[PDB]
């Protein structure tokens, strides 16, 4: 179980690159 | 189980690149 | 089970590129 | 099962490119 | 079990690059 | 196979994306 | 096969996307 | 196989992404 | 195999990403 | 195998990322 809230991320970025992935949450 | 809320992300970005993927949530 | 709400993403981006995909949610 | 609500995404973007896909939800 | 809230991240960054991944939450 | 590759070569493909 | 590739080459294809 | 590769070469592919 | 590789070579691939 | 490798060579791959 996981919870994540009220946060922020700011500025230009190189993205997300991901392999074989099962059941994850990816914000990128 | 997962929960994610009220957050933000700001600025120009290189996106998301993803392999074989099962049941994930991807915001990008 | 998953929940995601009230969030935002801002700025021009290179999109999402995805391999073989089963049952996922992709916002991009 | 999945739930996603009350969010937004803002700015011009390069879309979504997806391989073989089964039962997914793609907003792009 | 995990909880993360009210935080921020600021400045241009090299993204996230990820191997085989099961059930994680990735902000990037 | 003889001679150089600068692009992508695949024997069998199921799903996936190739950008030259 | 003999001689150079700059694009994409596939033996068997199911689904997927190619951009030259 | 003879001669140099600067790109990508795959025997069997399920999912995944290739950028030259 | 004969001659130098500067790119990527894979026998069997499930998922994953290749950038030349 | 003959000649030097400056890139990446893999027998079997599940997940992972390769940057040349």
What is the three-state SS of chain F? CECCECCEEEEEEECCEEEC
What Å resolution does this PDB entry report?
4.0
Distance from CA of I13 to the nearest CA of B (A): 10
Distance from CA of D1 to the nearest CA of C (A): 5
Contact F20 H15 (CB under 8 A): no
DSSP output for C1-28? -EEEES-EEES-B--EEE-SEES-EE--
For the CA atoms of A20, G19, I3, I1, the dihedral, rounded to the nearest 10 degrees, stands at 50
Contact G8 F1 (CB under 8 A): no
Q: How was this structure determined?
A: cryo-EM
- D vs G, Cβ pairs < 8 A, gives 9
Residues on chain D touching G16 (C-beta within 8 angstroms): 19-20
H/E element holding G17?
strand G17-19
Q: Output the CA–CA distances (angstroms, integers) from residue A2 to F10, F14, I9, in the order listed.
A: 39, 33, 38
Residues on chain E touching J16 (C-beta within 8 angstroms): 19-20
SS3 B6: coil
Residue of F nearest to H8 (CA): F8
Contact C19 F16 (CB under 8 A): yes
- I vs J, Cβ pairs < 8 A, gives 67
N-term to C-term CA, chain D: 20
> Does C touch E (3+ CB pairs < 8 Å)?
no
Q: Name, in order, each residue with C-beta under 8 angstroms of B2's C-beta and a sequence gap of 6 or more.
A: A1, A2, A3, A25, B25, C1, C2, C3, C4, E25
For the CA atoms of C13, D19, E18, I1, the dihedral, rounded to the nearest 10 degrees, stands at -120
Q: How far apart are CA C20 and CA B21, in angstroms?
A: 6
b/e C1-27 (16+ beta carbons within 10 angstroms → b): ebbbeebbbebebbbbbbbbbeebbbb
Q: Is C3 annotated as a binding residue?
A: no
Which chains have at least 3 CB atom pairs separated by less than 8 Å from chain A?
Answer: B, C, E, I, J
- Among D24, D25, D26, the strongest candidate for a mutation testing the B interface, having the largest count of B CBs within 10 A, is D24
Contact C20 F17 (CB under 8 A): no
DSSP output for E1-26? -EEEES-EEES-B--EEE-SEES-EE
Distance from CA of E21 to the nearest CA of A (A): 5
Residue H9, both tokens: 């070469």
Contact B16 A14 (CB under 8 A): no
Q: In what order do the strands lie in the sheet with C16-18?
A: D16-18, C16-18, B16-18, A16-18, E16-18
């Amino acid at each position: 179980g996981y919870e994540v809230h009220h946060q922020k991320l700011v500025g230009s970025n190189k993205g997300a690159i991901i392999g074989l992935m099962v059941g994850g949450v990816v914000i990128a």
